[PDB]
């Protein structure tokens, strides 16, 4: 998909083996914010959302929270609180045939800055503050949707980089996607199974200190009332 309409894909009810993506054919960058690229294997997540779009090798650094530029504030903006991974790889063989196969429409201008996680489909004409455009595109009336214009003989800063952005959410709901390790709640305690009142929608319990004190058993619906290990002064 193009940059102005990036594909948002929902995945669920599957085990995600991230390790094969971690070590594979050469990805140009692997920058994970708020999630360890190494320790990701023993994790469970509540939702995984992919953002597939194609950019050049120059503005890959702009796909990161906290910076501005030409694309990060006009086409795709990540939140300041961002827990996710960014991937990118060269696509000189899969794309960029000679002749300008530019179905890579990206928006040039926007009225104001972009709030995070927003797509723009409408192709209305740009600002024209002095003279209203009135639906024409003669002069001082630019079509904001722009083709990238890729060539296979271009420089290394002008190569199509297929960018997939994965966004997760950590330990705040029932988890549907997990790692390859043989409901994702991890901790240390003593199982003291009792009759806690399970409401039909409940999935975890919490104490006064906002820590885990009761955990729903992943197989059966009874309650594992966890208890911290016995300790004291000697």
């Amino acid at each position, epitope marked *: 998909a193009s940059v102005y309409a990036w594909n948002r894909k929902r995945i669920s009810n599957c085990v995600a083996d991230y390790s094969v993506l971690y070590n594979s054919a050469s990805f140009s960058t692997f920058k994970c914010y708020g999630v360890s690229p190494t320790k990701l294997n023993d994790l469970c997540f509540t939702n995984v959302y992919a953002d597939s779009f194609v950019i050049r090798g120059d503005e890959v650094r702009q796909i990161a929270p906290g910076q501005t530029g*030409k694309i990060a504030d006009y086409n795709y903006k990540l939140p300041d609180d961002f827990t996710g991974c960014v991937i990118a790889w060269n696509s000189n063989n899969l794309d960029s045939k000679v002749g300008g196969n530019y179905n890579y*429409l990206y928006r040039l201008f926007r009225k104001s800055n972009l709030k995070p996680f927003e797509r723009d489909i409408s192709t209305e004409i740009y600002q024209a503050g002095s003279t209203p455009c009135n639906g*024409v*595109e*003669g*002069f*001082n009336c*630019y*079509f904001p*949707l*722009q*083709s990238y214009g890729f060539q296979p003989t271009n420089g290394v800063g002008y190569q199509p980089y297929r960018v997939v952005v994965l966004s997760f959410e950590l330990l705040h709901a029932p988890a549907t996607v997990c790692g390859p390790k043989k409901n994702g709640l991890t901790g240390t305690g003593v199982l003291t199974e009792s009759n806690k009142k399970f409401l039909p929608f409940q999935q975890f319990g919490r104490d006064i200190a906002d820590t885990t004190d009761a955990v729903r058993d992943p197989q059966t619906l009874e309650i594992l009332d966890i208890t911290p290990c016995s300790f004291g002064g000697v």
Partner: antibody
Amino acid sequence: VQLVESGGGLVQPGRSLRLSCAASGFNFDDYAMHWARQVPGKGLEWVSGISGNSGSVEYADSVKGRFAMSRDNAKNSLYLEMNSLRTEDTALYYCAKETTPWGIYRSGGLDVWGQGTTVTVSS
Amino acid sequence: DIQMTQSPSSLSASVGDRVTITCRASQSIHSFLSWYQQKPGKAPKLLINSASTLQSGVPPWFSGSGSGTDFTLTISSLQPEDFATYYCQQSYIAPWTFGQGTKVEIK
């Protein structure tokens, strides 16, 4: 791609002197045709321009309301009407077609250049 | 509009050295600029479009870059067939303006 200009000559400032730039070797499309001028001895200046689906005419800052434009795509010829001439208009006129008739990014045109007719406005 | 200024107004260089040419806009211009070359008594020819894209028929020793307002242009090695004048031209808004010129001569 060949651009042939004609119509220039000696003219007292005040009367009309109509010129034309012939367009040949150019397929019919929605390219934007612009004018250009240059007084000898220094750099260049831009005069006018016409884009697709008619209308959309514009001139430079100090030449408002004294030139007239008409484009005929059937004859493949360009017409500019001269009115209210002054002494500073002595230049050689250049015609450009800018050769990027794509719906996305029509601007940033590669200004082609013909031979260029010369107008001598002497008092 | 747009007030276009260029520096320096004149220069002298030999064959094979390094010369930097810069133009400066009065406002945001992003990247809509063109690099032009003008021999005396000859037709113009575009070299660099949008300040970073090479044109067809131009060998890659002409390299220009820049963003925002201030720009730059770096010549890798000079030849006997480049001693001419230079201007900056934009394509943003209501009537465009050219540069004032910069001449390079034999020293």
